[PDB]
């Protein structure tokens, strides 16, 4: 049991460690939207940033970050996947896992997913980045920590 | 009854009308109320008594005295600071002869004065005078001497050692002289 | 409205008045917290003396706490009714007493004493219009005796029209606590009697006695004294706390207790001390009470008072009783035991009954009298400074802080002068 | 608040000390590791321990005390003790040199050479502390070391803080038994500096903790440890009102104000009571009038004199332990009317009263039992100015052929210094017998 | 309308007016965003806003404020906080080289580079408003870029605009504590320009903040959102009747034209209260006499100066919270007939009464607590004069030699500007001894 609140800790670090460097995040990403020509269409998928982490990439601070990330969203996978293989639990808890195991798809729509309070990750860029240019990159991870939180303490009463 | 002021210098501090007549000498005039009322009747058009407060604080005796020395030198009146900061810590002997001034300095009247200048600060003579040779600590000469007032207001480590061992050396010299007599 | 502000000083002083207040607070419905869980009727109308008044009827006590030891806030606080006190009165310095007037009065009452007269300026401002000021101390010592008469003496030179009632505690040569306690008595005489309006007598060894032979206690220790001399003050303050029929104040009776202001002091007493086996028998009367606050067994004096005469008597009842038959006790003990009170002066004992009985307890009295006994321990006292003056021993000390001898020769003057006052006016011939 | 600072010269003052530390950390539960390691079963600790040790943001103790010896054997015994994690290595300094029972050297050739180091850790120590009362220093008479040094440094100390209580704890060497045959030469110097330059003095001798052991105790081969263990137990009781509380505290500055009689006179007599074994403390009911009563018997006196000879100026009684006030006063009202106790015509009474809440604990491994309460007495009489007397004696006999004095000579000193230590000592002595002397 | 634009020189006018501008939202419930995203649960802002913001045609909040500074470290800092959505980076003006405790580089070769810009910028801040009548400059006396720059625009701002008010707020150097060496030579400059140039000035410093907030709040580490917090505080009780009203409001205009005696003695005391800490606040019954008898001492007062030391001449009285106008009838006759607080023989009487409605609010996170009611008042007293004069006490001996003005030689800048300084300080202190003394 304490294994997954040890990789739960541990995902908690690495996301502090994130918006600590969401500026640096942001400012890669928009000079990989300026190299592949896609300023238009706002990043709201993981395959997109894969994609251009893999192509339109020459930082090596960028692909560092980029990397990170995609371990970030790797790490709430496996997370996932080890709930799963845990036990079935409460109908609400599979809707939790399944929410969960959709939101950290590779291919999946996130321009109408955005954070709230208390989380500050919408704040820190102006709200047109979060609108049209970046609004699920960034409310994505504490987004998902929520419901891994709601769910292990769904799961402790039983 | 050793009130050290002389029958004239009471006979004029009783003549002024003083709120309260100071019982303890040393201790009242410490504050500088009763001189500051002093110089309010001698002189009203130039001090406030209202201004000054009737506290045993050594900050409020620090700015009453403060205000006095600003009055001072606007009057152009010689008064020893010595005398001054011995009278601000209530130092044995000092208001007395720092009253006498005053009276000498208002009334322009010439006193009889048993000692002018700096006397004998610590009691070495009354102890010698005294039988049963006395030989005081270097702690008990500290404690007559030095005061915990002055060591609030001004701290210098360097200026009291020095002080303090020239007193020693004052007390070794001394004892040496008393043994002589023996 | 007409408020009391109390005042401490002295270790003694502050677990007294620790004491008292929490016997208040049970007696009027007090809880630990700091709400109300009475259930009376005039524990809320005149409640407002000794508390005041707050949000959420939250009352809070009002007394400062003096002190020159940081050991005894601890001890205080850590009781079950020390969370509810002003931490801000609890002035407390960083060197303690040492058993000396002199220094006290000098160094730790030159830079400490700005702060209480603040805090009780403060208080005195935040009320309407006040009486008096109640300081309980101890002579033993010198943060009771050192700074209690120079408080004292601050608020009587602010407010002279105030009432100014102490109960400090009288030493004694067979229990002493201090070697030097001669001369801090000595000292503290001379302000008790220049710049104090009354004064009571406080005794511990008489309390002693008292518990052991009449009490019967396995283990007395200070708790039981503490608890006596607060019920003592309730006793003497429920004339204004609780209104019955016949009210008094603390002016009226300084002013009908007192002949000359050379001698304001007195002797309290209570009347109920039993044991408790013999609480489920006894007879509750007239008569008993009478003999219990007459004779000189239930008092706490140190001395006995059928060596001189009686000089002015007041007996403050508390319960429901009656009128004449206090007043023909006093008639008949008057009558009988002529030989103990001035005959120059008939009728030397007042009457006062308080229809509101205390808690706890059915019937209760205490007696405030001021008998001629206290001359014994006033010679007492100057023999012994007259001898340990003499040849000047544990003088050095007070030489050192400044302060020079002859406050000594005066202070020994007045007290031979008082002594001999006293003595002279004793034999109160009616004619040559 | 009430903190101090402890001094620790000499062998003797070092080993004192450890037992000092040792026996606080075993009251108030201070493991020797430094920190507090009990996290299953907790056995006390909860207490006001900022007097002698300190907190650290950790949850760490560090001593206050200063530890310091001209030889270095005695530190190196210490280090490679098992409290060895407890103290710190600055706080122990070493040397190179030392006196080993000689003035002259440890005064002027060996003393004089570490001064800003002691003087800068003092300092410091002092800094780490807010309030401060007075010092407990550590030494002996018959230690050069803790002669000469000591000397020296309180000068230094007396000179640097006149405000701050100077307090001193050492050994007399009784007239009878002694371990040198150069003590009252170091003596006579040290007497002197004691006595123009300091407040308070407390002189104790071995001979008679040696009779009261093997009295009491029952011990037929003694050694220093139980002597330790004493020293130790009469240092916490008299300064028991300050880690603790009680009904009536007594602080240090509230005693030696009324232990001083006078300037010249500030030599009390102390007497710890019970002194007893574990078969000792088991069918022997204890109430204080015994003990009180006991405490006056000159078998239990620290110093080997008769009360009876002299009599007593001034007097200060302490308690340790569950005492109930009605038995002191019994003990008091008893006291005051026994003939055998002789006293001035001057002082028909004084004393204290110092009730503490915490009774006296116990050593795994001691000789000391359980007792309910203790009792600790500090009088003050001129019976005990004989000892001066013989110090006297023997240093005339022995100064008038100049026996062992070349050595001090060719180590540089004043010839002098030898006679106006005398005629300090036979001035002192007559101001006791005037003292001591009635109307 | 009431409308008033802030201008923050230096980063301790930049913090000040982010403090102001986070009291502000918090109080109106103005959210980080600029929007109103509360649809679900209200807590309100239904008010008039429009003093201090302004509103969109998208339901936007724009602050209407000039965060100007030499240093862009400053800037970064504010930038990278969480309120970076709010404001425009336009209002923030960075700079390549700062004064940073120096006058003669940020008033002529500094400040004199970045002109146009900011006077385009307050420009266009004037122009978006419809009503104006006062401005709120923050900076510092210390600070190079709170005094020079400072000094430089509002010069300038005299000379464009006459009929709009002149306010001034900044920290004046303690004498006991202070921050730098050159505090003063910056300070006796700035002094001049604030008195010959403005209409009113208000000094505060930071040593009294420390006395009161160890006093009352008992913080043993205090911090500088403490003291920020206190100042917005203070500003918005000051400004309380223009964002709300009240039974008597009391405008910009209506405080200053009587706050004004002289033109030479526009220097008012302030004294926020109640300041007291959460536990301060719930024992404690509040009534409007004692805390305006509170008002009055000088441990509460900003500047520490003892007030029985002079007299007053003009007083201004403010209110904000559940008031009832009988007790301040009551405090009113009760301070009038009171014999401690002196007052000039001509003015027997003089204040205002400003009653609002709206109660203070609180903070999540800060030290005040929920107070029914509060009150600041502004006096006028010849006691304050004696800052000046340790000041000019301060300049003199720190010119006779010339310590530290060679740089300021090499700059360029005139030499007797410090004795212009010097003797307009000296004619403004003669001033107020003869207007302090009566008939």
Redesign the interface.
Known sequence: MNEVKESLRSIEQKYKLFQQQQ?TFIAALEHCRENAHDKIRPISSIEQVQSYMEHYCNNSTHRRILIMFMDICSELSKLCQHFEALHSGTPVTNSLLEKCKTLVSQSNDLSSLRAKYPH?VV?????DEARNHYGGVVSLIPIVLDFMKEWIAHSEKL | RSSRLSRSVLRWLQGLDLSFFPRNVTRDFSNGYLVAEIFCIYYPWDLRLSSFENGTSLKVKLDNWAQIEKFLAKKKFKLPKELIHGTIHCKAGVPEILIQEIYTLLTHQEIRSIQDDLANFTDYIYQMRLPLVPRNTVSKSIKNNIRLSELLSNPNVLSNELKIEFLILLQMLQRKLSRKLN | MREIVHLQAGQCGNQIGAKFWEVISDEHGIDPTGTYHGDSDLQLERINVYYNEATGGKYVPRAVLVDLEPGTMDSVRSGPFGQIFRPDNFVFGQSGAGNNWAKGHYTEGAELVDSVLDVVRKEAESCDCLQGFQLTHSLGGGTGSGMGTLLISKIREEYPDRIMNTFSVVPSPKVSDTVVEPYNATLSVHQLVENTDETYCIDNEALYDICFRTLKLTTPTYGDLNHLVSATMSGVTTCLRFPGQLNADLRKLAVNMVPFPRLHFFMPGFAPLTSRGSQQYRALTVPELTQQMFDAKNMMAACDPRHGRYLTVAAVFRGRMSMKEVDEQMLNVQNKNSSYFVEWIPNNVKTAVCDIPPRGLKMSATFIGNSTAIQELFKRISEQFTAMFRRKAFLHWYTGEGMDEMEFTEAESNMNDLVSEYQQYQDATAEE | MRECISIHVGQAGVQIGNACWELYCLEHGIQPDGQMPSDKTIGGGDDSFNTFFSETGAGKHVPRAVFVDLEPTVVDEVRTGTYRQLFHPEQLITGKEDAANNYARGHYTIGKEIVDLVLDRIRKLADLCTGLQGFLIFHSFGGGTGSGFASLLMERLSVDYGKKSKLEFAIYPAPQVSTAVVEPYNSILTTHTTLEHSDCAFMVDNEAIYDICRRNLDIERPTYTNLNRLIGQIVSSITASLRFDGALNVDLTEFQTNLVPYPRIHFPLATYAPVISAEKAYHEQLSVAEITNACFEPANQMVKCDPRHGKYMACCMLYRGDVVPKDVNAAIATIKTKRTIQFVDWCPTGFKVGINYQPPTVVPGGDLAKVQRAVCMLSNTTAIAEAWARLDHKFDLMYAKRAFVHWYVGEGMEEGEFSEAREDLAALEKDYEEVGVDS
């Open positions: 500026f500050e704040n820190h860029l102006s709200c």
